[PDB]
Write a protein that binds this ligand. Structure first.
Ligand code: NA
Ligand code: ZN
Ligand code: ZN
Lengths: 6, 50
């Protein structure tokens, strides 16, 4: 899955 | 500041993107969609999964 940290 | 998710709030913490290119929300806070850690492979949101 594609995730990011803010 | 753009807003995101089912909760309509600003970006914070870890976010996950819905793999339906037509998704109306696109990005979600992990906790809002019941996640603590990153799922492997494609993921769809609750509105897209039904
Ligand atoms: Na919606
Ligand atoms: Zn949220
Ligand atoms: Zn979606």
């Amino acid at each position: 899955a594609r995730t990011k940290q803010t | 500041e753009p807003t995101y998710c089912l909760c309509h709030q600003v970006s914070y913490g870890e976010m996950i993107g819905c793999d339906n290119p037509d998704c109306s929300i696109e990005w979600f806070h992990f906790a809002c969609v019941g996640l603590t850690t990153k799922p492997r492979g494609k993921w769809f949101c609750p509105r897209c999964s039904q």
